[PDB]
Amino acid sequence: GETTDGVYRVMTRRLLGSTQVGVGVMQEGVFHTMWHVTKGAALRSGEGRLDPYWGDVKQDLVSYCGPWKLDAAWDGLSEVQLLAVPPGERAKNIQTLPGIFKTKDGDIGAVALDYPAGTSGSPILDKCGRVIGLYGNGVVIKNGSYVSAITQGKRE
Amino acid sequence: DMYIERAGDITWEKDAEVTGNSPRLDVALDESGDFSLVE
Numbered sequence A: 001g002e003t004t005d006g007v008y009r010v011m012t013r014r015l016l017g018s019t020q021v022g023v024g025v026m027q028e029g030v031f032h033t034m035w036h037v038t039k040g041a042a043l044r045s046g047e048g049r050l051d052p053y054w055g056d057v058k059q060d061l062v063s064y065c066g067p068w069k070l071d072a073a074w075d076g077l078s079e080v081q082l083l084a085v086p087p088g089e090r091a092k093n094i095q096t097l098p099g100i101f102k103t104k105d106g107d108i109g110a111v112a113l114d115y116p117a118g119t120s121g122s123p124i125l126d127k128c129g130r131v132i133g134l135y136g137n138g139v140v141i142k143n144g145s146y147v148s149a150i151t152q153g154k155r156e
Numbered sequence B: 001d002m003y004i005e006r007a008g009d010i011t012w013e014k015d016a017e018v019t020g021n022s023p024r025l026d027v028a029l030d031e032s033g034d035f036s037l038v039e
């Protein structure tokens, strides 16, 4: 299948037409998405098969063909870009200064951008183009608007 | 049975649409990986 670095849509035909369930990153031969997109299922790339390798329902992360490779972190200061890939719509950068999820276990970057559920797995970037985490696991606030965690994995 | 299609390069795009705010939220993460608002 296609192994070129970049961002990819995650599609299914198990519903009406071809439905975009999410997004992911291909880097160093490994496909990175959120767990709730695939539920740990195998993926097709044309005629190639992608088999799950690592995943964790609590982090809501999964990798295919190898271990999680993305280890860049939000610096806690600078603005970031969501490389949103919405269903039926072209890849679009959205620049934002992340807010903060304060948890008993520490602080996490968060982006206040509302996109459709099928946008889950779209990467968040820094100034140098490196992926600092993925969009699509967050909360709905007093208003009714969505805030996503900047969800990042560990590189072993 | 899920499949992938390439959607773009991963590049920072100088002068892209700047938007969204920066809220500080108290949250809890349960064992199912669901975030909730503590209050």
Ligand SMILES: CCOC(=O)c1cnc2c(C#N)cccc2c1N
Binding pocket: A114, A115, A116, A117, A118, A119, A120, A135, A136, A137, A146
């Ligand atoms: C569908 C069930 O409700 C949710 O938990 C849930 C709600 N909204 C989103 C958004 C938005 N907007 C983006 C990405 C993931 C979600 C999302 N998982």
